[PDB]
Amino acid sequence: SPYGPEARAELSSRLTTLRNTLAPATNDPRYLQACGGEKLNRFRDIQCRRQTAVRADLNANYIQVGNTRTIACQYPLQSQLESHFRMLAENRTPVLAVLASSSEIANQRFGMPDYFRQSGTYGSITVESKMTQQVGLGDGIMADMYTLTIREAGQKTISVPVVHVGNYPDQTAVSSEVTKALASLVDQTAETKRNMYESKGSSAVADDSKLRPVIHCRAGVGRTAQLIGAMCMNDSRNSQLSVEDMVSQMRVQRNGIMVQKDEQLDVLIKLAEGQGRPLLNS
């Protein structure tokens, strides 16, 4: 019964209501507005909750799901790259997970710059990319890893581990098994890097806004939300956090599109069922 069609219909009912309530109005005080004529939102109707925004010129949010702290963002626009790199460096980012595929990044019409697989200079920031490991996730899906070294006069140099799902499939969800493997890889990569900062006495360890995994796909609401949900279920501190809680938290803290497609929610429901985790709040 707890995972039956009736419960799933009720979950969808609650979530649909929330999406509608959170839809952005014109100049909505709840959402970050572009300062001028420069594009902020990659998609006009996929907006950035103002109160949890990371930077005034990025579509990017702090999200806490139960105890699990992350940043979810859109794929940065070309015009946003310098700010995006500064965000990554200031956060002492312990892992950057990119869920847009190589084919999507290569599609010029999508305007997704290949900012992490090659080196470059963006305003005052110089970035070096190096390839590291490759980890299979199941179903032939492969995580290609990199290190991004971000240099800028006046700032400390920061290196960021990157997990890129280069062959993330199109027009379909990855399975619960692949998602679990991806969440484990992302969390493990973050733990290793966070530990290095702790060992060096970094002040970022004490700052709730820093040391957050940064996750994006194209818009930061579909694949990204599926992964964040899986990461929260991979966190031993989150006993009794329901699927309703996790999706509501993502939506209130970023936008009402988080977990964009029913196919993505299906994966989260399957993961929850495997754990005996509730779908709904009583």
217 is catalytic: yes
In CATH, the architecture of 1-282 is: Alpha-Beta Complex (3.90)
Q: Which of 178, 152, 143 is nearest to 271 (CA)?
A: 178
What is the rounded distance in angstroms from the CA atom of residue 150 to the CA atom of residue 63?
Answer: 24
Can you state the angle between helices 5-21 and 243-253, rounded to 10 degrees? 10
Conformation bin of residue 104: beta by default, left when phi > 0, alpha when psi is -120 to 50: alpha
Q: How was this structure determined?
A: X-ray
**Residue extents of the structural domains in the chain:** 1-282
Resolution in A: 1.0
- Choosing from 48, 73, 217, 232, which is the catalytic residue? 217
Q: Which of 55, 31, 35 is nearest to 45 (CA)?
A: 31
For residue 77, what is the DSSP state? P
Query: Over the Cα atoms of the chain, what is R_g?
Result: 18
What is the rounded distance in angstroms from the CA atom of residue 11 to the CA atom of residue 169?
Answer: 27
Q: Beta-carbon neighbour count of residue 242 at 10 Å? A: 17
What is the rounded distance in angstroms from the CA atom of residue 52 to the CA atom of residue 3?
Answer: 32
